[PDB]
Design a binder for this molecule. Structure first.
Ligand SMILES: [Cl-]
Lengths: 172, 168
């Protein structure tokens, strides 16, 4: 069944750039049952953990993070690219292959003491997630754990995210 | 109680530019009960309607579109800014910005509900409807958490059934 989800993920050569094989998640999303199952297995992988909020980075993160928040009866916080959030924000820099970029969170998104599960579609290098984790901590939040639908085990995302509990459903 | 949701919608002056008042729905999202209630009301408003899929234009549209699709037991299709979708896309230009959808996102004949957070002028939603129809999908209805009634989005979307929970 997870095997079946895995086989439904479309691999696209050289997107966004040559050397990357992109994991296209849209066929999972458009299939009612596959989408439902994906959310259910994410919830299931979080059993036994204590948390108050889900946070996800824009934009593919939202697609699993927001329904999973709904499914778990918790709140949802978007972590966003610069310029998108209207109110006062905090910003955090992360590494790209040959540069840096930033992500932002609203200053009021997480309260001190709140336990947060960070969700995303895929763990690659882990830069966007690292920045998200640090944004949550800057507000007094604690990162309970980090969950992904898929993980690229050749890219050392786990190493970048040292000290965090990392869960992924499908490991490539 | 929807009155409560409305009071959690923060109004931000001068964003994204001077003289524009922005409706910030992030306080609704971060409150577990408010977020749950918003999704349940959106689903309640769609009761008695016939549809196969939910579509939402990126990315604020995802925030309600995906959980709503999950709640209603249907599939979800993202409509996206150009260069974001990996596979073969169809495209649609509007006054100029552009939106794209996967060639295979929607089957011919499939009935689609389009979801977004807020109805303003209706441009991006108009484009989203045209993209769905480009694939031979049929727009059942279009639903928003909020609608700025002073901006004539309904007129721009003439011919579509428009639902909104909160009217400003
Ligand atoms: Cl209405």
């Amino acid at each position: 069944t997870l095997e079946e989800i895995k086989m439904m993920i479309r691999e696209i050569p050289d997107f966004p750039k040559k050397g990357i094989k992109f994991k296209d998640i849209t066929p999972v999303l458009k299939d009612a049952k596959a989408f439902n199952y994906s959310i259910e297995m994410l919830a299931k992988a979080l059993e036994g953990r204590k948390f108050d909020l889900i946070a996800a980075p824009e934009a593919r993160g939202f697609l699993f993070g927001a329904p999973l928040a709904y499914r778990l009866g918790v709140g949802f916080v978007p972590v966003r690219k610069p310029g998108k959030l209207p109110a006062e924000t905090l910003s955090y820099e992360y590494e790209l292959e040959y540069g840096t970029d930033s992500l932002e969170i609203h200053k009021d998104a997480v309260l001190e003491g709140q336990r947060v599960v960070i969700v995303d579609d895929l763990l690659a290098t882990g830069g966007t997630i690292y920045a998200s984790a640090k944004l949550v901590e800057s507000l007094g939040g604690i990162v309970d754990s980090i969950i992904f639908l898929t993980e690229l085990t050749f890219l050392d995302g786990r190493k970048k995210l040292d000290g965090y509990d990392i869960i992924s459903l499908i490991k490539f």
